[PDB]
Design a protein around this ligand. Sequence first.
Ligand code: MG
Ligand code: MG
Ligand code: MG
Ligand code: MG
Ligand code: MG
Ligand code: MG
Ligand code: MG
Ligand code: MG
Ligand code: MG
Ligand code: MG
Ligand code: MG
Ligand code: MG
Ligand code: MG
Ligand code: MG
Ligand code: MG
Ligand code: MG
Ligand code: MG
Ligand code: MG
Ligand code: MG
Ligand code: MG
Ligand code: MG
Ligand code: MG
Ligand code: MG
Ligand code: MG
Ligand code: MG
Ligand code: MG
Ligand code: MG
Lengths: 205, 292, 58, 159, 169
Amino acid sequence: ARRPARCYRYQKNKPYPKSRYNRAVPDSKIRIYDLGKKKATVDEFPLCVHLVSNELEQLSSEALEAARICANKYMTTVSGRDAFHLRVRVHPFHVLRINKGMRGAWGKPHGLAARVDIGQIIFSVRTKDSNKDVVVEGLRRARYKFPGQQKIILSKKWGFTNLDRPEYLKKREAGEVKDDGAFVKFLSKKGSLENNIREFPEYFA
Amino acid sequence: DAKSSAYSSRFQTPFRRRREGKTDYYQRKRLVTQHKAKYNTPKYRLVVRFTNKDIICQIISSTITGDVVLAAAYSHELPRYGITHGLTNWAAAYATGLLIARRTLQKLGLDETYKGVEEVEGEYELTEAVEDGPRPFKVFLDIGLQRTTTGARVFGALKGASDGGLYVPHSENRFPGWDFETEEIDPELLRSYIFGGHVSQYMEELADDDEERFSELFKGYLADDIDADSLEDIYTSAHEAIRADPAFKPTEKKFTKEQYAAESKKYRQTKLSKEERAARVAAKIAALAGQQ
Amino acid sequence: AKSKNHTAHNQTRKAHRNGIKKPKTYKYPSLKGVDPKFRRNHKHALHGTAKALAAAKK
Amino acid sequence: GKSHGYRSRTRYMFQRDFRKHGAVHLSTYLKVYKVGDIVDIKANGSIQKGMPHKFYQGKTGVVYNVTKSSVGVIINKMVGNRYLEKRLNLRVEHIKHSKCRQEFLERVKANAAKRAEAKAQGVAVQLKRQPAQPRESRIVSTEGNVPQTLAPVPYETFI
Amino acid sequence: QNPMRDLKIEKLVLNISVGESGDRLTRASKVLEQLSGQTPVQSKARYTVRTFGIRRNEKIAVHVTVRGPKAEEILERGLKVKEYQLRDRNFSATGNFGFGIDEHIDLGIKYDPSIGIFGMDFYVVMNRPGARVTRRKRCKGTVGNSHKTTKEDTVSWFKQKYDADVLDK
RNA sequence: GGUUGCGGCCAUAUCUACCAGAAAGCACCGUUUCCCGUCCGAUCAACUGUAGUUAAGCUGGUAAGAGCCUGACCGAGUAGUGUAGUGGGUGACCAUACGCGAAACUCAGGUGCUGCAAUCU
RNA sequence: ACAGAAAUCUCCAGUAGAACAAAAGGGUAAAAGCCCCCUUGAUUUUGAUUUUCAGUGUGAAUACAAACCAUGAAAGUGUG
RNA sequence: UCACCUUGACCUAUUCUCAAACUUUAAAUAUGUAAGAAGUCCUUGUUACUUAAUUGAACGUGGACAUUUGAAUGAAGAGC
Ligand SMILES: [Mg+2]
Ligand SMILES: [Mg+2]
Ligand SMILES: [Mg+2]
Ligand SMILES: [Mg+2]
Ligand SMILES: [Mg+2]
Ligand SMILES: [Mg+2]
Ligand SMILES: [Mg+2]
Ligand SMILES: [Mg+2]
Ligand SMILES: [Mg+2]
Ligand SMILES: [Mg+2]
Ligand SMILES: [Mg+2]
Ligand SMILES: [Mg+2]
Ligand SMILES: [Mg+2]
Ligand SMILES: [Mg+2]
Ligand SMILES: [Mg+2]
Ligand SMILES: [Mg+2]
Ligand SMILES: [Mg+2]
Ligand SMILES: [Mg+2]
Ligand SMILES: [Mg+2]
Ligand SMILES: [Mg+2]
Ligand SMILES: [Mg+2]
Ligand SMILES: [Mg+2]
Ligand SMILES: [Mg+2]
Ligand SMILES: [Mg+2]
Ligand SMILES: [Mg+2]
Ligand SMILES: [Mg+2]
Ligand SMILES: [Mg+2]
């Protein structure tokens, strides 16, 4: 009572979002996009591992659940559920239609899928450096729930941030880094010095 | 408080003088836009502005790069014609409008023809075109932002410029003496306003009612010993002097423009440079995060 | 029965068989939609110029 | 059904061009148009009178008529396999002068000037434009410029 | 500091909301009239709730604005009725202040057909010289930050002249 | 050079906060008989530059300010894209050839200019 | 004061986040919104032009010209 | 408690991801015009239009400029 995903595998249509014209879209069954120890400090989880798409296709929300649960459960079992942070980095925003014999054959909403490119991250995990084999094995287990080809790239970035590991260490053993609840805030050379003293005391030495 | 950055980025400023509150650009479009088949003919406006302590009347056309003044008359140059006090009154506006009319008609060669209403009586009149001669100078009234009300001094300036021989299109329901019942202007109140009778009757009734007000007000009148019943021939001799020599003598200029400029430069705060800004930032860093 | 609604296929090749024509301009276009007051004065300004060049040569 | 009104498919054409809404500046109303001037057509969306059809956006034509607030414009329009002359009645805020007819008129004045300095002496001054030419012989020095460059780069992922 | 930076009363508005039309609000307009010396103006209802018993555009209120010396003595009468006890509240952050009373028309009395009483809202708007720049037609400016009225400055002025006390029971 | 009136281009001009402004101007300010307008001479109107003041407006400056503007071989010749092949690949797509070529980003710089008229240590 | 989340009144902020009969899009801030005053230009004559297009018609619209008017101090605007 | 681990929100600075009927920005390809003798300058003729005013407008007379006469390539004749 569900069409196989090869029917809706490829990005054949313009993106059909839930809008004021769609109005009757069933709910995405992936609803949790951060898992593990999501509240952890940027300094806690320096190593970032990425599951990256090699193909231009669509990932169903069913497949996103089925891979998220598998990677989460392998990492929870082998390494404990507070030793990793998992982020689904795609959201199923495209509505797939089904026409359930060709007069008036415009389809009603079937489901929700996520349009991915070559080189988009689907899942990102940050851990300690000693958890690398468990994370790579969890993501390679999560590969089987996704159609197409996906590579496991070790990021050269500290955590979920967008700067390199020696650059982040040069930035935090100097004074341009202060913590947020799960992410971090950086100090700039621009803005009022009264506010850049109100935050970041540890710089200007 | 707290204008957001999105608000600042999406904000559209009004022009400069709408921001300054000086130009109704809605009115300016209609006053400045020439008939396109009259191709380069300048459309002339009698700009009349009443600040405190001065009346400005300028005959202005518009160009691409800016407006151009044909002639200008100020109420503070009426002391050369014999009006020292009340330089923003309704009659002073009349004398300034008569002066801009005579100055413009002397600048354009239309002073022999188009004398105007030579003896001011206060009747509704338009400058008729001389047959087989030049047409009179067509000027359009620019009152700017101030309200059109019955008895306002913009129409004193209108009345004086029309009486000086300019063609200004105007109706008569905005002069003092108009009444809302019958469509008729009253020349008695119109002529008394032209010759300052509304000021003079006030001086008479204050001089018969109470003197602590009549010494606060009209003190310079008493110092120049001008009677209440003698403003009319002051204004009449002023109109004769205007019609006899309106040709704009300027002032002496009295410590010339470079000596004005060098003295007024010593009060301009000069904008700083990158070097003083970097030094200021570094010294502020030392003073604020240098551990007291 | 259902058929082919519309296509612009072959239409540019047909238009370039005789090779889309510019409308062949002339000195002195017509006064079609030219302003009538300008036309009325243009009539008299050309009447007087015909007489002026008549008297200039004779 | 279908819809082919006068201003159909004009959602973006007659839009008013971010942070430039509101009143039209006054040089638009003080520009002077003569019959025979070559004008560009771009409809202001904030003035609905005298407004050209959406076909005429970006079209360039000749003033044939001048009126109280409007000019008439000849535009050539390709109807089928020929060109038809269209007469437009456009107010002057939908009209601007062509800068090409400026540039060509200073080229006409330059041509007359150099022909005058060729008549003064030195005839055959060669006063047509030329396309961009192939460059001549250079000598390239190696003075503080010793040619030093490496190879193609290895692949790294940097993700 | 500066005489032009002095704090004045500019207007005092007397609002009586009578959520109906007819004789009661006609007499509520009357009781505003002989106190103010001025004819008041009625206010229409903006919309309809059908819980307050008000319908849209029904003239359910009266108010009048009094200025200058006439405002000052009506304010003095209102503070004698309120026994000079304003609160920590009643003072706006913008430096305006008001209260509410009833039945203070004991003196300054007309023919007086005493059938029915009304309560009444006092509101006082406080400013400095130079507030014309936000009200005039030409060059409509904004009052500067130093020149604005504040709650601290208006409560200092109020526990000066009229020599009252705020917040106290 | 200041200031005024009228502008042009419409933020390099706006916004937030603070500090200065001689002279003239502008301004606030003073009065209600008159023309006029309001519930209210607050706004509008009139009258006096008199009773007063630079407090505000206004102008100028400051700010590792927000915004805006300019530039950069900064990203980036990247993305995209016209043309070509009996190129590759099951496909999805991709590479090469001949051309065109972004935006965000990152830096650095800037923060009204100017026309007519009048006036001013 | 009654009076609360909603009744009126006062101040501050507010680039439109409102409104403009009715779809949706465009447009509009001393306005095209709101409120008031005056009105009938929603008139007459007959051409031109644009869009649909065959460059026919019809509908709708544009700009003028000859009048007569309205409005405003006026420039101007007004042929729904 | 009658100011307390276990507060809904709301605002503030961040964060992951998107849009045929979203957008500050914005290509490539496609598309309008121009690249002159019906052109340009100098002088002065017409008129009932226009200007305060031969001020302009439009069309003119007389004069100066000879194919490198105003980019390229081609033209197979061009136009009707
Ligand atoms: Mg099956
Ligand atoms: Mg499809
Ligand atoms: Mg797979
Ligand atoms: Mg405007
Ligand atoms: Mg107006
Ligand atoms: Mg059948
Ligand atoms: Mg068929
Ligand atoms: Mg086709
Ligand atoms: Mg064919
Ligand atoms: Mg054909
Ligand atoms: Mg449509
Ligand atoms: Mg639209
Ligand atoms: Mg556009
Ligand atoms: Mg219409
Ligand atoms: Mg006053
Ligand atoms: Mg309706
Ligand atoms: Mg047709
Ligand atoms: Mg036919
Ligand atoms: Mg139709
Ligand atoms: Mg219509
Ligand atoms: Mg008309
Ligand atoms: Mg209609
Ligand atoms: Mg209409
Ligand atoms: Mg599309
Ligand atoms: Mg866009
Ligand atoms: Mg060519
Ligand atoms: Mg002309």
